[PDB]
Amino acid sequence: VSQVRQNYHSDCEAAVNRMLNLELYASYTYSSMYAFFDRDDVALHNVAEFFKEHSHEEREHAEKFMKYQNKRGGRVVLQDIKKPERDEWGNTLEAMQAALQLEKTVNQALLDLHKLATDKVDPHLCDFLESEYLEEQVKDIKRIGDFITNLKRLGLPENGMGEYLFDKHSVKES
């Protein structure tokens, strides 16, 4: 074992690798959403940029797991990054509903990791998750829910004008 390794269970090391992969998968989904909203036949550029930003965020959170792994004396083991579940994302509402689900999936995986770290009496891992991931996740889930509520209010999916307006007012100008 690594000369730095202390209080780091094999199960947690493996779960960190899995979480790394899931963050990369989430990044890739968001990248697909970006490309969809950039299409000439979709053309919601602020929406697209929102998803691009989130893709980069998730990639950063993957990298933070790699650094963590090494700091603890675990070993990074990479797996294929699965393509997103869809090739096209319907409209802003459908995309945001998918983003909500994705965020909740990532959140559940983080909560499960936290429970494993608790059961293996690893406070450093618990703190890392709490300090670097769990709050930012609650905030992302809240913001996407807020957005879904507004898209419904605006009459999505039918109300194109509502869709247009969301891109102008709800997401930052890009």
- Binding-site residue positions for Fe cation: 23, 58, 61, 103, 137, 140
Alpha-carbon gap, residue 129 to 125, rounded angstroms: 6
Partner in contact with 9, chosen from Cl ion, a second copy, Mg ion, none, beta carbon below 5 to 8 Å by kind: Cl ion
Determine whether 40 is exposed, middle or buried from the number of CB atoms within 10 Å of its CB (0-12, 13-18, 19+).
exposed
Q: What is the residue whose two structure tokens read 């998918």?
A: 98
Work out whether 64 is an interface residue with a second copy (CB under 8 A). no
Which residue from 7, 10, 101, 108 is in contact with Mg ion, where contact means CB under 5 A?
A: 10
CB of 50 to Mg ion, least distance (A): 12
Nearer to Mg ion, 130 or 158 (CB): 130
* Range 86-125, binding a second copy (CB under 8 A): 87, 100, 104, 107-108, 111, 114-115, 118, 121, 123-124
- Give residue for tokens 């797996």: 79
10 binding a second copy? (CB under 8 A)? no
Residue 160: strand, helix, or coil: helix
What does the alpha-carbon distance between residue 56 and residue 46 come to, in Å, rounded to a whole number?
15
9 in contact with Cl ion (CB under 5 A) = yes
Q: How far is the CB of 57 from a second copy (least distance, A)?
A: 13
Distance CA 124, CA 51 (A): 31
